[PDB]
Design an enzyme around this catalytic site. Structure first.
Site, PDB file in Angstrom:
ATOM      1  N   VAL A 226      -8.353 -14.016   1.308  1.00  0.00           N
ATOM      2  CA  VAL A 226      -7.333 -13.398   0.428  1.00  0.00           C
ATOM      3  C   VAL A 226      -7.768 -11.867   0.095  1.00  0.00           C
ATOM      4  O   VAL A 226      -7.145 -11.383  -0.816  1.00  0.00           O
ATOM      5  CB  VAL A 226      -6.645 -14.136  -0.411  1.00  0.00           C
ATOM      6  CG1 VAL A 226      -5.928 -15.358   0.199  1.00  0.00           C
ATOM      7  CG2 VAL A 226      -7.479 -14.668  -1.367  1.00  0.00           C
ATOM      8  N   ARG A 228     -10.412  -9.102   1.609  1.00  0.00           N
ATOM      9  CA  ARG A 228     -10.339  -8.037   2.449  1.00  0.00           C
ATOM     10  C   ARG A 228     -10.753  -8.515   3.832  1.00  0.00           C
ATOM     11  O   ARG A 228     -11.663  -9.411   3.768  1.00  0.00           O
ATOM     12  CB  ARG A 228     -10.937  -6.730   2.217  1.00  0.00           C
ATOM     13  CG  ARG A 228     -10.848  -6.244   0.794  1.00  0.00           C
ATOM     14  CD  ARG A 228      -9.402  -5.567   0.517  1.00  0.00           C
ATOM     15  NE  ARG A 228      -9.226  -4.664   1.406  1.00  0.00           N
ATOM     16  CZ  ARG A 228      -9.484  -3.331   1.628  1.00  0.00           C
ATOM     17  NH1 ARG A 228     -10.609  -2.972   0.623  1.00  0.00           N
ATOM     18  NH2 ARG A 228      -9.062  -2.768   2.491  1.00  0.00           N
ATOM     19  N   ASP A 252      -5.167 -14.504   5.125  1.00  0.00           N
ATOM     20  CA  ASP A 252      -4.049 -13.506   4.865  1.00  0.00           C
ATOM     21  C   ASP A 252      -4.299 -11.974   5.106  1.00  0.00           C
ATOM     22  O   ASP A 252      -3.507 -11.259   5.153  1.00  0.00           O
ATOM     23  CB  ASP A 252      -3.698 -13.539   3.206  1.00  0.00           C
ATOM     24  CG  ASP A 252      -2.417 -12.754   2.831  1.00  0.00           C
ATOM     25  OD1 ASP A 252      -1.360 -12.860   3.680  1.00  0.00           O
ATOM     26  OD2 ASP A 252      -2.492 -11.976   1.975  1.00  0.00           O
ATOM     27  N   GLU A 257      -5.039  -4.742  10.413  1.00  0.00           N
ATOM     28  CA  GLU A 257      -3.725  -4.939  10.118  1.00  0.00           C
ATOM     29  C   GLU A 257      -2.725  -3.954  10.564  1.00  0.00           C
ATOM     30  O   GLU A 257      -2.917  -2.631  10.059  1.00  0.00           O
ATOM     31  CB  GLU A 257      -3.436  -5.477   8.708  1.00  0.00           C
ATOM     32  CG  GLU A 257      -4.535  -5.191   7.742  1.00  0.00           C
ATOM     33  CD  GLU A 257      -4.483  -6.255   6.398  1.00  0.00           C
ATOM     34  OE1 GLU A 257      -5.333  -6.759   6.527  1.00  0.00           O
ATOM     35  OE2 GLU A 257      -3.461  -6.002   5.789  1.00  0.00           O
ATOM     36  N   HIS A 276      -0.758 -10.537   5.284  1.00  0.00           N
ATOM     37  CA  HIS A 276      -0.869 -10.070   4.168  1.00  0.00           C
ATOM     38  C   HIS A 276       0.261 -10.052   3.126  1.00  0.00           C
ATOM     39  O   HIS A 276       0.617  -8.864   2.596  1.00  0.00           O
ATOM     40  CB  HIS A 276      -1.513  -8.514   4.634  1.00  0.00           C
ATOM     41  CG  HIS A 276      -2.279  -8.088   3.289  1.00  0.00           C
ATOM     42  ND1 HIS A 276      -2.939  -6.754   3.522  1.00  0.00           N
ATOM     43  CD2 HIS A 276      -2.756  -8.496   2.074  1.00  0.00           C
ATOM     44  CE1 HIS A 276      -3.792  -6.416   2.399  1.00  0.00           C
ATOM     45  NE2 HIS A 276      -3.693  -7.416   1.657  1.00  0.00           N
ATOM     46  N   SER A 278       0.004 -12.740   0.639  1.00  0.00           N
ATOM     47  CA  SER A 278      -0.165 -13.958  -0.488  1.00  0.00           C
ATOM     48  C   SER A 278       0.175 -13.856  -1.924  1.00  0.00           C
ATOM     49  O   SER A 278       0.604 -14.449  -2.585  1.00  0.00           O
ATOM     50  CB  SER A 278      -1.698 -14.259  -0.426  1.00  0.00           C
ATOM     51  OG  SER A 278      -2.422 -13.045  -0.598  1.00  0.00           O
ATOM     52  N   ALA A 279       0.197 -12.322  -2.416  1.00  0.00           N
ATOM     53  CA  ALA A 279       0.512 -11.966  -3.296  1.00  0.00           C
ATOM     54  C   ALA A 279       1.038 -10.766  -3.572  1.00  0.00           C
ATOM     55  O   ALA A 279       0.469  -9.462  -3.863  1.00  0.00           O
ATOM     56  CB  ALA A 279      -0.557 -12.047  -4.555  1.00  0.00           C
TER      57      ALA A 279
END
Length: 310
Positions: A226, A228, A252, A257, A276, A278-279
């Site tokens: 999670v 890079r 993630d 990307e 991408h 997760s948070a």
């Protein structure tokens, strides 16, 4: 209205509401919901709050810009040597601990309790239980000991896991049973049931999860990335997952990307992919960061979350 703030975020509507509620004197708040409207306005902004990718094509026009608050933790696109550096850039930090615990343990318990299997059995009206284990006494290894690593640590300890951290850095931090340093990694991996990589992308963390040498570490281990995409050589993660070198991977973040629809990653049965997310940077918390930084800024005091261009 003395200084001008320009909002260039997908969350503009939420930011505008929140910032208008904050009643900041001597600040005109402008908003641009697309790039075209921003073209006309950015030259007027002393302060910018934006996603890095949205600001980047407009930055050469930002000739009054003093301070840019990124809504994202990641600002790498702004460190491009082609971009200006004659302003203060801050990112978002310290607000992602709980969200990362939720992501990591939701995914972890999904796997441990075989939820997708049960969902598929339900589709076929099949009642059948299978073996599983609890988290009690299993070992969580976390790479990264900041506020994110620490929160995931407290959650593992809550679930009765052993919690080991990796750092150097070095320091013993809250939530970790013990904190070790990069040399101890292979020794630490060997006893890891779950591995959580949350590393900043340094030259030393480039392809930590290397081709093979590293992946030679544990049949049923679950690896999360999670931090890079850079932490992992994807070609060699794949072979690891294909040849029983690693149990599962939850990723993630990626070398590229959005992950190209081409990627062999998509199809791998024991690889789980999230886009991408997760948070997320929730505007209520980011606006709070902005307003605290704004108070420091107009007093000439050091900003928090400040990015050093060097």
């Amino acid at each position: 209205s003395q200084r001008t703030l320009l909002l260039l975020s997908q969350d503009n509507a939420h930011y505008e509401r929140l910032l208008k509620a904050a009643h900041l004197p001597h600040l005109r708040i402008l908003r641009a919901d697309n790039q075209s409207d921003a073209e006309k306005l950015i030259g007027e902004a002393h302060i910018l709050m934006a996603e890095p990718a949205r600001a980047k094509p407009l930055l050469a026009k930002a000739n009054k810009l003093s301070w840019f608050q990124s809504t994202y933790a990641g600002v790498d696109v702004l460190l491009d040597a082609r971009c200006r550096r004659d302003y203060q850039l801050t990112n978002v930090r310290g607000i992602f601990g709980p969200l990362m615990s939720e992501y990591v343990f939701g995914h972890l318990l999904s796997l441990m309790r075989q939820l997708p299997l049960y969902r598929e059995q339900q589709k076929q009206r099949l009642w059948q239980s299978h073996p599983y284990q609890g988290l009690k006494g299993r070992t969580l290894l976390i790479l990264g000991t900041g506020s994110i690593g620490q929160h995931i640590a407290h959650t593992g300890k809550h679930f009765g896991m052993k919690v080991l951290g990796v750092s150097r850095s070095g320091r013993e931090r809250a939530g970790f049973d013990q904190v070790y340093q990069l040399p101890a990694l292979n020794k630490m991996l060997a006893q890891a049931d779950v591995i959580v990589s949350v590393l900043p992308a340094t030259r030393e963390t480039h392809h930590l999860f290397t081709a093979s040498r590293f992946e030679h570490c544990k049949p049923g281990a679950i690896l999360f990335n999670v931090g890079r995409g850079n932490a992992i050589n994807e070609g060699d993660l794949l072979t690891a997952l294909r040849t029983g070198k690693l149990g599962m991977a939850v990723l993630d973040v990626f070398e590229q990307e959005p992950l190209p629809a081409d990627s062999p990653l998509w199809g791998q049965p024991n690889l789980i992919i999230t886009p991408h997310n997760s948070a997320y940077s929730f505007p209520d918390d980011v606006a709070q960061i902005f307003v605290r930084n704004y108070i420091r800024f107009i007093d000439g005091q050091p900003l928090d979350g400040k990015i050093d261009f060097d």
